[PDB]
Amino acid sequence: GGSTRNGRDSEAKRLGVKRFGGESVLAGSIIVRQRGTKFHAGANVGCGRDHTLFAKADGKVKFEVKGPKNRKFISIEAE
Amino acid sequence: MLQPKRTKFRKMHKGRNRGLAQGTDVSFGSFGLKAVGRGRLTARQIEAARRAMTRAVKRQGKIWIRVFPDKPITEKPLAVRMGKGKGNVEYWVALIQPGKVLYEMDGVPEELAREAFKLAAAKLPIKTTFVTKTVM
Amino acid sequence: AKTIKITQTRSAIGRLPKHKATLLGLGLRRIGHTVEREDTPAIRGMINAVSFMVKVEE
Amino acid sequence: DKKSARIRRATRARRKLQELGATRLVVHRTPRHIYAQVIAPNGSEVLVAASTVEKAIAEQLKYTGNKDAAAAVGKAVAERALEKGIKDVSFDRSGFQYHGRVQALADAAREAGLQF
Amino acid sequence: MFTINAEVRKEQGKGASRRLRAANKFPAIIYGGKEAPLAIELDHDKVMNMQAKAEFYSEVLTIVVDGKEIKVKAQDVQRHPYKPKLQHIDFVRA
RNA sequence: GCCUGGCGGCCGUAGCGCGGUGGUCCCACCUGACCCCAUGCCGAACUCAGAAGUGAAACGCCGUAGCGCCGAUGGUAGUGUGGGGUCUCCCCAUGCGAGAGUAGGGAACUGCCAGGC
RNA sequence: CCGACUUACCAACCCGAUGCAAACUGCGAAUACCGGAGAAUGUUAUCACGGGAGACACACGGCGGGUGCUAACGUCCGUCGUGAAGAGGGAAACAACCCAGACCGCCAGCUAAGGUCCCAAAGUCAUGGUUAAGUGGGAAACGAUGUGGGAAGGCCCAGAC
RNA sequence: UCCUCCUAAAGAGUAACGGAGGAGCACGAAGGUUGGCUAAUCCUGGUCGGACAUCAGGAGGUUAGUGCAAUGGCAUAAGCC
RNA sequence: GCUCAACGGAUAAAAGGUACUCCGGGGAUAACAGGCUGAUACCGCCCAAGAGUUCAUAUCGACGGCGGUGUUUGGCACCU
């Protein structure tokens, strides 16, 4: 028969890279599709809707593993 | 025989054959038919070597088959052009790397095991060797 | 500080763009060109990046 | 386990107050006593504490772990908080309901001057 | 008795180990849990003949390095996948 | 110094199992419930008022490796660059170098406040 | 009969051992990518705006793959190199392979790949071996007292084959 | 035409008449908030309950569930009242 | 107010025949033949359960395996 169909996305991964000086609201990890690979806990709580993680203060990205579940968190720390 | 009862997916990619085999030791039996060289071992060749073994040992002792034909191989029919989808699944192979113990034997004398392994090796495409259980 | 001599010995024609840019960062132009470069782990890393072409007088 | 269920009830508001950087007035309630702790937003050091097991609070009360005892502990913790000079704390239920001794402690802190 | 004459390893790595196997010797390691492990190389044909002797694994062996006798025991053997030869042995101090 | 409670840090060298141990200090079960309140019935739970009783259960502490968990050294697989046999796969120089196993470790450590001895 | 075997054939669970997976992951590289700092080098190579384009039929080779038959000078992608649009030397002849990027002239020298008996420039070079088929100078399973090297193993001067 | 996975080479992207599946809606609650709660499965005693209806106890730990494909999620639950 | 679903949507509005044909092009693309490849075809060999009365190999040889030729049906679309 026939089985040749596919969808499209054009980004699916992080943009902030833990040295990245992201200001204001830059999407640190857009189209993660989900709050579980990365959580936002440094600059308050990101993860608005479609779980896009974004900065809330002008500063450097921070990647870290916290919690009892060994979950990965994106933080924003000041320069 | 030796086609799996179910598969998650009907067809696979062709792939490439790996470096070296896991399962190089003689584990269950006392003698083994180790593989020296790469290739794909068809289920029909596996069955033919098994029958040669079993009749050579006269259905005495116990024989282990350490490989299984879990990869479906598709072939296009005759006088059809390229494309138009992937071909129909025709037969099943096991990918063999050098060092893979293919068969195992116990409960027989060593020379009778060597004769049965030689008659199986005459049916297999790849070059094989006789190995014995070693303690480590 | 101490300086070393780096001489090109092979051509840069079929090489990778990273290899060509490493020769540009070294300062080598011709197939016999020699340069005097100050001794530094960065210069040594460029030599190790393209070491099949260069020849180093210490 | 009742303590584990209480921690599961408390955890959502505890992480929400941790993310806001809020100085938490937490309350612990037992059948015998009630405890109040104003804790700095880092969560590691306790700024102000007032407990029913403290003898100065416990001598004035007919029964420890009463609603009157909860009001006395809330008044005491708000008095020590305003003596320390800190204000604008956020109240943590710590898994309990806002009812009875917990509500009485928070109402006494609000009356004595700790604003939420 | 099972005495093996062994030499210490000047260089470790896959290239050095393959150079040993090209020079018909093979690497080995000794560890005891009380002191630092010692990396050695062995004469492959001699240690092969001691493999073919079937009492190699049961009893206590004697490795001589620099004239020093070390009482060991064979823990595991890494064998070549499709040739008789062997690549690596680890010895536990007995 | 010891024990207990609360909030953390760190998240299996942190847990589970087995055995022992603690009591109107503290905490749990426990007494009663019209009343502050609740059960799509349930004073199970949530609450409130607390004369007695026991720590039995839970919880805390200690011991035990049985299971989880961590885990070298050495080797192997892979691979960047250059070179070479190649019919479909490898080899050499050099750089990086696992995973699984092995020896072994391991019955957490620590900060603030409060209470009793 | 409130049943004293659970079968000399098997479809489930668990335990111990053994593999396999593009659409499996309790693990996990090398590289690549993103950002920051620093030196040296590069005719600011980089970015923005504006004037003028062409091009949107690609090919082969290496690596990683789908498809095909792990077929095709096949087809479709990623990536690099070359040709396209690059002569010169080599592979006999040879777009794409190897070496190397031609401003012009020289009856000057040194080298790369590749070679050095004659065609045809340069070793009938030096030392140590191997092969006797013209292997070199096409081809597998499999077969054979071809002939070198190495580590061992039986019988044997109480007489081994 | 749109969505999900693989191909796809551990950033993004990436083709084929490649391998598999779905969508052209639904919901005024199936949205918001507050308060509360935790599954699949297995072993047992009892009304047609029989192997599976409903209780009670134990084991287990997310093997469930998500309005609907697949993937990534989810206990502080985004799952249930 | 769109199955403008050929979903960046030619128009509100549209199916066929041509062996009677015609033009502009293409070896960018098919038919014949050549080329590459050899799945298929044809030929040969390896193992030997057998049958051949006993006996594998006088003759044939299952289950399987490895090649050769260009040689059928094909694949590709390199030449025209």
CA Rg value for chain B: 17
The conformation of residue C27, written as its DSSP 8-state character, comes to T
Please identify which residue in the block is written with the tokens 């002792």: B61
Specify the resolution in Å: 3.0
Out of 3.30.1390.20, 3.30.830.10, 3.40.50.10420, 1.10.1240.10, select the CATH number for domain C1-58: 3.30.1390.20
Write down the CATH number for the domain with range D1-116: 3.30.420.100
Write down the CATH number for the domain with range E1-94: 2.40.240.10
Strand blocks (E) in chain D: 24-29, 34-39, 46-51, 90-92
The answer to whether position A4 is within a domain reads no
Distance CA B4, CA B8 (A): 11
CA angle, B117 then B123 then B127, to 5°: 70
- E63 by Cβ neighbours in 10 Å (0-12 / 13-18 / 19+) ranks as buried
Question: Å from D6 (CA) to F28 (C1')?
Answer: 15
E15 three-state secondary structure: helix
CA dihedral (E32, E37, E38, E43) positive or negative: positive
Question: Å from B91 (CA) to I60 (C1')?
Answer: 30
Please identify which residue in the block is written with the tokens 């109402």: D107
Q: Do chains B and E touch (3 or more CB pairs under 8 A)?
A: yes
Distance CA B107, CA E54 (A): 21
Distance CA B132, CA B34 (A): 10
**Residues 6+ positions from E54 with CB-CB distance below 8 Å:** none
Nearest to A36 by CA among A76, A62, A69, A63: A69
Q: Which nucleotide C1' is nearest D5 CA? A: H37
Structure tokens at C38: 């100050």
Q: Which nucleotide C1' is nearest B45 CA? A: I64
Distance CA B102, CA B112 (A): 18
Please state the domain extents for chain E.
1-94
Structure tokens at D108: 């006494």
Q: Quote the distance between the C-alpha of residue E61 and its chain's center.
A: 11
- List of chain A residues whose C-beta atoms are within 8 Å of the C-beta of residue D20: 44
- CATH numbers and ranges of domains, chain B: 21-136 (3.90.1170.10)
Distance CA D10, CA A53 (A): 25
Please state the domain extents for chain D.
1-116
**Nucleotides of chain F within 7 Å of a protein C-beta?**
5-12, 25-31, 36-37, 45-51, 58-59, 72-78, 81-83, 88-97, 101-105, 111-116
D20 three-state secondary structure: helix
E53 near B CB under 8 A: no
- List of chain A residues whose C-beta atoms are within 8 Å of the C-beta of residue D19: 41, 44-45
The answer to whether position A32 is within a domain reads yes
Q: Quote the distance between the C-alpha of residue E62 and its chain's center.
A: 11
Number of domains composing chain A: 1
The answer to whether position A7 is within a domain reads no
